Amino acid sequence: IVGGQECKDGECPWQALLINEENEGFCGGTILSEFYILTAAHCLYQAKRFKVRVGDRNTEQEEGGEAVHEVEVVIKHNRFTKETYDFDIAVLRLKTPITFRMNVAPACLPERDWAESTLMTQKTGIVSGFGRTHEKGRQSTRLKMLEVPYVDRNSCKLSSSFIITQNMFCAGYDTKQEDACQGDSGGPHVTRFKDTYFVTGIVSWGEGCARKGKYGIYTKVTAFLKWIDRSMKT
Amino acid sequence: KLCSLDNGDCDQFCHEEQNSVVCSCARGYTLADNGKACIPTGPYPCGKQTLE
Ligand SMILES: C[C@@H](C(=O)N1CCOCC1)N1CC[C@H](NS(=O)(=O)c2ccc(-c3ccc(Cl)s3)s2)C1=O
Ligand SMILES: [Ca+2]
């Protein structure tokens, strides 16, 4: 996250971190239930073996809420493609269930039609992660969040040097210096409605981070609700 | 009208049927007696920031 602020105690409880063999985070995820994590399909290539950490806000101190979980099954969308990052979505089933507590809780899955007319027409959504603090910087040791405006679909297509498919949407700022970045990928994009937070996107890609005339590109979760439902049963 | 007027007074999901508002809730909530509000069924319901 470029800009924004620290997630304070209890504020981003659905955040998950995919960690490599060295215990280093390389991508984010969203807690959907006691057994399932939502992430990006493209993240499933950045490490041979990985685990999922939850309940963490500072990677340099032990706060007492942290828990590491092994992955039992990796469910990748079969139509995923590296050429465009179309269908950039995967679901992970964990070996042991997550025990909810302070800093560890799921985000709500919304219904498609209601989310599209009512959530995605709100002024802003919230993105979060432990990724880079600027395009050429290091990863954050503190969990951060940032309010990002929804961006008009036409303006987004005009701004982009790469194809924006029906399975993607744009959010962020034209010139203001605030954006998601590398390492935040696979992480939560949520939208608040009457003090309840619903999953609306997955951090996917961008042309660098916070560049002028450029926006953050997110997987459009509302296009994948039946798919997600199916994955969480089989 | 209906769901386009202040989400139909619903706490969460709003749907229109036979020219009438019908409210519903995410998994882990139950619809209240008034047919509008959503009540958590147990501890740590989805979408809420944690306080204990
Ligand atoms: C355009 C894109 C790219 O190479 N694609 C996208 C389309 O599919 C083919 C390859 N691209 C260029 C470099 C960039 N890699 S990066 O700087 O490590 C990076 C990862 C994630 C980034 C995000 C910024 C804002 C959001 Cl949301 S996430 S910034 C990146 O993702
Ligand atoms: Ca910690």
Q: Could you confirm whether A189 is annotated as catalytic? A: no
Extract the tokens encoding A218.
Answer: 């997110």
Task: Please tell me the CATH code under which domain A1-12+107-222 is placed.
Answer: 2.40.10.10
Residue A140 is which amino acid?
S
As a three-state string, the secondary structure of A166-233 is: CCEEEECCCCCCCECCCCCCCCEEEEEECCEEEEEEEEEECCCCCCCCCCEEEEEHHHCHHHHHHHCC
Dihedral in degrees, nearest 10, Cα atoms A220, A222, A228, A229? 180
Would you state the structure tokens that stand for residue B21, as one six-digit string?
Answer: 């508002």
Write out chain A residues lying below 8 Å of B45, CB-based. 105
Give the span between the Cα atoms of A83 and A60, in whole angstroms.
37
What's at A202, amino acid-wise? I
**Residue A209 in contact with residue A132, Cβ under 8 Å?**
yes
Solving technique: X-ray
Tokens 């304070």 correspond to A8
Q: What one-letter code names the amino acid at B4?
A: S
B6's torsion region: left (phi>0), alpha (psi -120 to 50) or beta?
left
Q: How many CB atoms lie within 10 A of CB A203?
A: 33
> Which residue among A204, A205, A220, A221 has the greatest number of ligand 1 atoms within 8 angstroms of its CB, and so is best to mutate?
A205
Which helix (H) or strand (E) element contains residue A75?
Answer: strand A71-76
Structure tokens at A28: 């984010």
Write the CA distances from A46 to A19, A25, A42, B39, B46, integer angstroms. 10, 10, 8, 41, 29
Backbone angles phi, psi at A58, to 5 degrees: -135, 110
First to last CA, chain A: 34
**Token pair in block for residue A174:** 């034209």
Provide the residue count of chain A: 234
Chain A residue with CA closest to B14: the answer is A114
DSSP A93-160: EESS----BTTB-PPBP--HHHIIIIITTSSEEEEEES-BSSTTSPBPSB-EEEEEEB--HHHHHHH-
Token pair in block for residue A38: 């939502």
Reduced to 3 states (helix: H, G, I; strand: E, B; else coil), residue A44 is: helix
Span(s) in chain A for CATH 2.40.10.10 = 1-12+107-222, 13-106+223-234
Close Cβ partners of A230 (under 8 Å, ≥ 6 residues apart): none
State which residue of chain B sits closest to A112, comparing Cα positions. B13
Gap between the Cα atoms of A171 and A185, Å rounded = 14
Question: Who's near A227: CB < 8 A, 6+ residues apart?
Answer: A77, A89
Which of A128, A140, A185, A204 is the catalytic position?
A: A185
Which residues lie below 8 Å from residue A62, measured CB to CB, with a gap of 6+? none
The DSSP 8-state label assigned to residue A58 in this structure reads B
Determine which helix (DSSP H) or strand (DSSP E) holds A19, and give its type and residue range: strand A15-19
CA of residue A58 to ligand 2 center, whole Å = 4
* Domain definitions of chain B by residue range: 1-52
Phi/psi-derived region of residue A129, left when phi > 0, alpha when psi is between -120 and 50, beta in every other case = left
Please give the Cα distance from B22 to A91 (Å, whole number).
31
Cα(A40)–Cα(A170) distance, rounded to whole angstroms? 16
Bridge partner list, A74: A92
Contact A190, A14 (CB under 8 A): yes
Resolution rounded to one decimal, in angstroms: 2.0
| Distance from residue A96's CA to the centre of ligand 2 (Å) | 20
Could you give the count of Cα atoms lying within 13 Å of B30 in the half-sphere of its Cβ? 4
d(CA A162, CA A56): 34
Bridge partner residues of A216 (DSSP): A171
CATH topology of domain B1-52: Laminin (2.10.25)
Whether residues A100 and B26 touch (CB distance < 8 A) is answered with: no
CA-based R_g, chain B, Å: 12
Contact A40, A204 (CB under 8 A): yes
Task: Enumerate the residues of chain A whose CB falls inside 8 A of the CB of residue B48.
Answer: 105, 195-197
Q: Are A181 and A158 in contact (CB under 8 A)?
A: no
Residue nearest to atom 8 of ligand 1 (CA): A84
Is any atom of ligand 1 closer than 6 Å to the C-beta of A169?
Answer: no
Domain A13-106+223-234: which CATH class? mainly beta
- In this structure, which amino acid lies at residue A102? M
Q: What angle do CA A5, A11, A14 make, to 5 degrees?
A: 110
CB count in 10 Å sphere of residue B14:
24
Cα angle A131, A107, B37 (rounded to 5 degrees) comes to: 150
CB proximity list for B18: less than 8 A, separation 6 or greater: none
